[PDB]
Structures are given as C-alpha cells and as structure tokens.
Amino acid sequence: IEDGINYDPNDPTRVTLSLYAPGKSFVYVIGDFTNWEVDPAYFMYRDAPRPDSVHWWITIEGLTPGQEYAFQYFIDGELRLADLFAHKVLDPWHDPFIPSSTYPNLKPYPTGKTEGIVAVLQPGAPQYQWQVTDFERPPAHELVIYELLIRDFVARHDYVTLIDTLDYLERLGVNAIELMPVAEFDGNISWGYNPAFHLALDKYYGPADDLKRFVDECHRRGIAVILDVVYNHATGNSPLVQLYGPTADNPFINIPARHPFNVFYDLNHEHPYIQYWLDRANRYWLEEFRVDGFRFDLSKGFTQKYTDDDVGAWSAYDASRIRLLKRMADAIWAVDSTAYIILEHFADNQEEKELAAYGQDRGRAGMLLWHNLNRAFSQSVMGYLNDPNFSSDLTTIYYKNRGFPTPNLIAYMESHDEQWLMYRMRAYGARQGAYDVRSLPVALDRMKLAGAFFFTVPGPKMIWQFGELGYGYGERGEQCLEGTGDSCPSIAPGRIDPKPIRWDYRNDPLRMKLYRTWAELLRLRREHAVFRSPETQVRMRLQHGVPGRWISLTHPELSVVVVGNFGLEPLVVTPTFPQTGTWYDYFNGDSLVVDDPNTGIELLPGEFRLYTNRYVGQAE
C-alpha cells in the first residue's frame, strides 16, 4: 500500500485509499459510493508508526468493476480534498466546457453533492493493450526533439487528432516528440505551467487511453515521447497547498519563494514528503504511459537556497540543488536506467557540467540541459551580424566550444518561450538593395541556411512546432510572442494565449521547401554518424559579425563542409576543407575539386552548401 488509490490485481470490486496527513484529527472518505454523505463505515484508520509518518487509510469493498467513482477526503469536518495522487479529477468550474468530442461520455461533476475538485477511482479499469514491445529509444545525445503544444498544434487539441499528424512528424526526421505539460493544470486553456494534479492527465487533451495509443504509435515509428513536467510549484488547487493551507505554516511550500521566477506556490524540495511525491510522479508517468523521459520545467527552482530576486545568485553553483536533482535522477534511473532527464536549467557552467556528467562513469547518460541559441540565431537570420547589443556568434552550438566534454546540451533556435525567428525576420530583418530579409521567400531561404548550421552539428537538438513551415509574423504580425523584448503589434495574442493554427502552410510550396530542406538534413543525419557522434572533430568559422560562415566535420565514416552566406550581398566564403580531393554538393548534385584546403565558394546572400568528401547521394 502506497498513498493514493490502490487497486487489488486479483479483485476488481475493491480499493484501498491512503492519505499522508500529520496533524489532523479525523478523516472520512466521501464519494459516489457514500452518496456524498458521511458514513461511519468510511471513517479512516490512522496509521502513525512515528508522529512524522501519519497516514489515514481505508479499504472499500463492494464496488462495481469498470465503474468510475468520484471521491474526496473529508478532513477534520471542514476540508474536502481530492487525492494528491489522483490520476483523473473532475473539475466543477471547467469540465462543463470540455466538448463531448474532446472527452467522450465524460462523467459529470456531482453538482450540489460536494464542492471543489473531486478525484476519480475506477476498479476493474480496462487495460490498454500495448502493441510495441521492442522499441529502442534513441541515444540521449542523439535526440532531435519536436516541442509540441497540444492546444495549438491541432484545432481539436487532443490525442486522437495528434495520431493523424504522425506521418508529417516522422517525415520531418525528428526522433522524439516533447509534449508541453499534459498533467492536470488549472482550467482548460493553458501552456500547462499551472499544475494542480501532477499525476492526473488533463482532460482537455482527451482520454488517457488515447495518449497511450499515441505513445504506442510513436514507438511503432521509432519516435520517443518526452513529457514536459512542472514540479517547481503547484497552484492553490493542488492538495499540497490545500492540505495545510496557502501560508508559511504549510511545510510543503515556501512563502516567500526561495528564488526568482517563481509562480504559484514554490515547493520545498528538501521536504521528505515532496521527494516521495516527486519520485511517485516520475515513476507513474514512466510506468503508466511508457514515456521515454521528462523535461523538467524550471529545474533551477529545485532548491531551498534563498536568492530572493537575484538571478545571478540563483544561477550560481548550488550544491544543495545539485544534490536534489541527482537524488531525483537516481530514483528515475532505478525505475528505468535509460529514461531521458532533460533540465530547463540555465545555471552556471560548473553546475551544468556536473549534472551533464552525472552517472556517466557508472551506467547513465547524464542529464541533458537546454541550450538557448534563440538570440544568436535571431541575429544571424535577420542579417544583423555586428549588432551593438546582441551576439550573432554561433560557435557554442558545438558542446566543446562551451567547454563541455560530452554532447549533453540540447541546442535550439526556437522554443515555446522564445520569439519565432520568422517574426523577427519579417518585422525587423535587414535589407540591401533588392535583397530584403523581411520578404517571406527570402526569410524562408534564411531558415534553410539556419538549419544547415544547426541540424548538422553533433549533440541533441530541439525545434518548436511549425518553425519548419516558417511560422511567425503571419499575415500582419499576429504570430508574435509577447514578453521577449520585441514590441508585438496590438493584434498579437497575449504571451500564453492561443496562437493561430495554420496547417494551410502545407499548401504553400515555398514553405514546403523549407520543411523538405530540414527533412533532408535530418535524413542525412540519421544515417551518417559524422553529424551525431562525440568522435566527430569540429572546426568552424561562426564568429560574431562574420557573414561568410562555415563548419567542418571529420569522422571515420565521412567528412563534411557546410558553407553559408549570412550577409546581405554576394560573397566568396573560404572554408578550410579538411582534405583535398573531390567534394560533393549534396543538394545540387555536382562536385568541386579542392586542390587547396582553402578554396573559395561564391554564394548569394542567404545561400548554403553542404559538401561531403565521398558521394552519399543527392537531396530528394
């Protein structure tokens, strides 16, 4: 027996419920099976082996197999609380607005019988029949991740509709999908960073068995699924907050928050019960939905070290935080030794290096860290390479140039938290003569160039939905993210508000050429280890201000030179080819003789070329 809802694998008519609640006087279970009344047979037993480990529990008999029952703990005759470990809840304020098409036959809230969110249990639950048994998850350091917000990815915002997009995603050449938070969040309309029930599946995206079908279908196609998960904080609807109230008296929470950038109620990760709950949550998502790992939102917030509103102090090396993250990782890897642990961290290099290295000497992949190159890519594609404020240097895309010994950095040009590159190009892009980065077709070409200087570099990578079709700006600037230091037009939505959904972009041949370029780069990457391996040696000319940029890669199987003109006029770019001989132009289907490692390539602005030292086919 654990806290939460315990089923009997041999008897689908019964459950045992357990609640951690030191300091309480008495507890009842109320619910469908008590007609929401107080019934003595539902007064809970107190198990208190030591005063700091008080659990209330009861075994409930005589339930109907397959039936859903709503319930709450009724604590000290006042507090009605849904189970912290509920996997499904009914929300009286927001469930009325979930369409029947989104969640068929959704059990209605028991209006007037109780108040507040209720938990749902279901003895004899039908078990999804998993089809894929032999799934091999991509090596952590080879991840090419597609960040997806279900709300804005498809108009129907649900798992069953996601399944219809898988051909589109598979063909792009990504090997993992990262879903923005799926765990029960306040309301229906959210990015998902307002979690209420961290082990429940938000019903606005559809039923659990449809998510299972999605994970299984991804697995069938060799694609991993990562869940973005939000454990720094909990909303006031979380039982962590409600059980002892939203004050400093509540030992689970920090009032005030311990660090900058907190939202809702900052959790105390040093609390043993919070550690237990966190471990339970990670274990649940792995076991129940067979996901391949997690992206931990606001992982720098996993600390009791007090840094107030001082970002520099917060970001500095924090031994306690490192202990906590390692302890969490140990538990995850005891469930599944190759699950991905991805941190949205942004700490100082000493800390990030230590978390990256962790476990690599004793059976683990290390943690993966978000590596934000949105600004530098923004400057590069806009054509402001010697900007007075913002670096256009792309050198650190390669992990060793950031002083990391192993490919544990997930680089991205774009994320849900950052401006769209196409917004910045179309709103602000540079121009010279008749060459205008603000023109859509010109801007799309610059995203091909960006991709050639991104997907080709060893180490994991992430892209944000629809960048591959040139999402951003839109018709008149409405595709603009607020809060990124750009003054969006008035027509743009608020930062976390629903964004335009534009699947019609597939009908634009210019936008599909960008998609196909990225897809062809990722098709190459899939079968050529040069683009993926820690063994690859990388040299580059990606410095701030320099329009004629290049990357060389050398590996036992292949050598590659990528050339690009990030300027606004024609230029001869002179890479250092690693060897003389014939080099083959992948996209254009011809070849160049390199009689000196320093050979010039004339390029129009925005153009790139990818050369290999052996013929390996032609882009199709």
Q: Which stretch binds Mn ion (CB under 5 A): 70-78, 264-272, 310-318, 482-490?
A: 264-272
Cα end-to-end span (Å), the chain: 57
DSSP-derived pairing of the beta strands 55-60 and 45-47 = antiparallel
CB under 5 to 8 A by kind: which of Mn ion, Ca ion, none does 147 bind?
Answer: none
Q: How far apart are CA 528 and CA 512, in angstroms?
A: 24
Asked whether 60 and 15 are in contact (CB, 8 A), the reply is: yes
Is 277 or 420 the residue whose CB approaches Mn ion more closely? 277
Geometric angle at alpha carbon 606, from 475 and 401, rounded to 5°:
110
Asked whether 102 and 158 are in contact (CB, 8 A), the reply is: yes
Asked whether 418 and 476 are in contact (CB, 8 A), the reply is: no
Number of residues that bind Ca ion (CB under 5 A): 2
Is 266 or 520 the residue whose CB approaches Mn ion more closely? 266
CB under 5 to 8 A by kind: which of Ca ion, Mn ion, none does 520 bind?
Answer: none
Is 235 or 479 the residue whose CB approaches Ca ion more closely? 235
- Number of CB atoms found within 10 A of residue 356's CB: 24
Q: Does 195 bind Mn ion (CB under 5 A)?
A: no
Helix 374-382 and helix 421-428, axial crossing angle in degrees, nearest 10: 40
Is 313 or 510 the residue whose CB approaches Mn ion more closely? 313
Distances from the Cα of 246 to the Cαs of 74, 118, 185, 214, 336, in angstroms? Answer: 18, 19, 18, 37, 35
Q: How far apart are CA 415 and CA 407, in angstroms?
A: 19
CB under 5 to 8 A by kind: which of Mn ion, Ca ion, none does 359 bind?
Answer: none
Q: Which stretch binds Ca ion (CB under 5 A): 16-24, 43-51, 177-185, 502-510?
A: 177-185
Q: How far is the CB of 210 from Ca ion (least distance, A)?
A: 16
Is 238 or 479 the residue whose CB approaches Ca ion more closely? 238
Q: Which amino acid, 68?
A: E
State the DSSP code for 139: P
C-beta nearest to Mn ion: residue = 301
Name the CA dihedral angle for 612, 617, 619, 620, rounded to a multiple of 10 degrees. Answer: 180
Distances from the Cα of 400 to the Cαs of 139, 295, 539, 603, in angstroms? Answer: 19, 23, 11, 29
Number of residues that bind Mn ion (CB under 5 A): 3
Q: Which stretch binds Ca ion (CB under 5 A): 121-129, 185-193, 289-297, 462-470?
A: 185-193
CB under 5 to 8 A by kind: which of Ca ion, Mn ion, none does 31 bind?
Answer: none
Name the percent of the chain in helix, strand, coil, to the closest 5.
25, 25, 50
CB under 5 to 8 A by kind: which of Ca ion, Mn ion, none does 232 bind?
Answer: Mn ion
Is 235 or 613 the residue whose CB approaches Ca ion more closely? 235
Is 301 or 567 the residue whose CB approaches Mn ion more closely? 301
Q: Which stretch binds Ca ion (CB under 5 A): 130-138, 151-159, 196-204, 466-474?
A: 196-204
User: Two tokens at 482?
Assistant: 């607020």
Q: Which stretch binds Ca ion (CB under 5 A): 127-135, 149-157, 183-191, 457-465?
A: 183-191
What does 106-122 look like in DSSP terms, one character per residue?
Answer: PPPP-TTT--S-EEEE-
Q: Which stretch binds Mn ion (CB under 5 A): 46-54, 132-140, 299-307, 458-466?
A: 299-307
Phi, psi of 275 (to 5 degrees): -60, -45
User: Two tokens at 391?
Assistant: 């670096």
CB under 5 to 8 A by kind: which of Mn ion, Ca ion, none does 301 bind?
Answer: Mn ion
Residues 12-31 that bind Ca ion (CB under 5 A): none
Q: How far is the CB of 600 from Mn ion (least distance, A)?
A: 53
Q: How far is the CB of 275 from Mn ion (least distance, A)?
A: 14
User: Two tokens at 354?
Assistant: 């230590």
Q: Which stretch binds Mn ion (CB under 5 A): 46-54, 297-305, 330-338, 343-351?
A: 297-305
User: Two tokens at 371?
Assistant: 């590596």
CB under 5 to 8 A by kind: which of Mn ion, Ca ion, none does 20 bind?
Answer: none
Distances from the Cα of 588 to the Cαs of 319, 502, 585, in angstroms? Answer: 52, 31, 6
What does 557-590 look like in DSSP terms, one character per residue?
Answer: S-EEEEEEE-SSS-EEE--B-SS-EEEEETTTS-
Is 266 or 436 the residue whose CB approaches Mn ion more closely? 266
Q: How far is the CB of 119 from Ca ion (least distance, A)?
A: 14
Is 179 or 257 the residue whose CB approaches Ca ion more closely? 179
Q: Which stretch binds Ca ion (CB under 5 A): 198-206, 380-388, 410-418, 464-472?
A: 198-206
Distances from the Cα of 352 to the Cαs of 344, 396, 400, in angstroms? Answer: 11, 15, 13
Phi, psi of 505 (to 5 degrees): -60, -25
Q: How far is the CB of 99 from Mn ion (least distance, A)?
A: 35
Q: Does 459 bind Mn ion (CB under 5 A)?
A: no
Site string for Ca ion, 419-458 (x = CB under 5 A): ----------------------------------------
Is 23 or 96 the residue whose CB approaches Ca ion more closely? 96
Q: Which stretch binds Mn ion (CB under 5 A): 29-37, 295-303, 405-413, 516-524?
A: 295-303
Name the CA dihedral angle for 354, 356, 359, 361, rounded to a multiple of 10 degrees. Answer: -90
| Alpha helices for 221-297 (secondary structure H) | 239-242, 272-289
What does 374-405 look like in DSSP terms, one character per residue?
Answer: HHHHHHHHHT-TT-SSS----GGGSGGGGT-S
Is 304 or 591 the residue whose CB approaches Mn ion more closely? 304
Q: How far is the CB of 3 from Mn ion (least distance, A)?
A: 22
Out of 181, 301, 470, 567, which residue is the one contacting Mn ion (CB under 5 A)?
A: 301
Q: Which stretch binds Ca ion (CB under 5 A): 199-207, 275-283, 470-478, 507-515?
A: 199-207
Is 185 or 285 the residue whose CB approaches Ca ion more closely? 185
Q: How far is the CB of 341 from Mn ion (least distance, A)?
A: 18
For residue 6, what are the β-bridge partners?
Answer: 16
Q: Does 266 bind Mn ion (CB under 5 A)?
A: yes
Is 202 or 210 the residue whose CB approaches Ca ion more closely? 202
Q: How far apart are CA 73 and CA 4, in angstroms?
A: 11
Half-sphere exposure of 525 (CA within 13 A, CB side): 27
CB under 5 to 8 A by kind: which of Ca ion, Mn ion, none does 505 bind?
Answer: none
Place of tokens 């005589």: 62
Site string for Mn ion, 212-241 (x = CB under 5 A): --------------------x---------
Is 189 or 335 the residue whose CB approaches Ca ion more closely? 189
User: Two tokens at 128?
Assistant: 């999804």
C-beta nearest to Ca ion: residue = 202
Q: Which residues bind Mn ion (CB under 5 A)?
A: 232, 266, 301
Q: Which residues bind Ca ion (CB under 5 A)?
A: 185, 202
